[PDB]
Design a protein around this ligand. Structure first.
Ligand code: ZN
Lengths: 235, 10
């Protein structure tokens, strides 16, 4: 069985109702990246930034938000491949988890987690973060921040990811824009180590020409159809 | 791979 590494971006969750920085102008929920997606933004206006992620966290857990067919297809892929499958996502949502995927590497963190500003320890969290919420890991309880990797910060699980990139027989990028590094550079790593590279996207990423195989269209239709050939090619 | 960054800086 081939070793498969899958990278997913915001495009896969778009059909589920989760939006991100628009291609047209880079605004996320009509907010500048710089104000809500940087360490500096958090420092100048912690009240606004905390409120922003409170809204995102609440929106994520609304009844009408569900994993779509593309999420489900990836869960089936892991079932079939087991240990030879690894899922890395740039998304902070939990739709991969809800779909049935396990050991998902959230390289940009998770919306449903917070982090101690003193220990750096992550903490499961589903509600609002108020100023009176503190950590549970320190003798002297510290303030909490979203467990989301901001621009200017180091992504998570990079060592595991680069190891899988060198081992992967097939690398599949799904719903990635190609604007966000180092994630956008993963396809170059995979191809360097002899992996077969595949892009599945609504629109061609800004590195789409580096992929050997590509299919474009709605994620909920393109991803399940690519996954099924693959499962059928396994026989 | 370095820190999380966008291709466009300015
Ligand atoms: Zn603490």
């Amino acid at each position: 069985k081939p070793r498969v590494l899958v990278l997913t971006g915001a495009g896969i969750s778009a059909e589920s109702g989760i939006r991100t920085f628009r291609a047209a102008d880079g605004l996320w929920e009509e907010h500048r990246v710089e104000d809500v997606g940087t360490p500096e933004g958090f420092d100048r206006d912690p009240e606004l930034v905390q409120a922003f992620y409170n809204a995102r966290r609440r929106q994520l857990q609304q009844p009408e938000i569900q994993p779509n067919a593309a999420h489900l297809a990836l869960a089936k892929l892991q079932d079939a491949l087991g240990d030879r499958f690894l899922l890395v996502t740039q998304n902070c949502d939990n739709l991969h988890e809800r779909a049935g995927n396990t050991n998902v590497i959230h390289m940009h963190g998770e919306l449903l987690k917070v982090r101690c500003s003193q220990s750096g320890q992550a903490l499961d969290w589903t509600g609002d973060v108020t100023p009176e919420d503190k950590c549970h890991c320190c003798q002297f309880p510290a303030p909490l921040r979203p467990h989301v990797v901001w621009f200017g910060e180091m992504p998570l699980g990079m060592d595991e990811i680069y190891m899988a990139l060198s081992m992967a027989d097939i690398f599949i990028a799904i719903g990635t824009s190609g604007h966000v590094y180092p994630a956008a550079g993963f396809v170059h790593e995979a191809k360097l180590h002899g992996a077969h590279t595949v892009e599945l996207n609504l629109e061609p990423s800004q590195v789409g020409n580096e992929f050997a195989e590509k299919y474009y269209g709605p994620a909920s239709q393109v991803v399940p159809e690519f996954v099924e050939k693959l499962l059928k090619g396994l026989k | 791979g370095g820190a999380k960054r966008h291709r466009k800086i300015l």
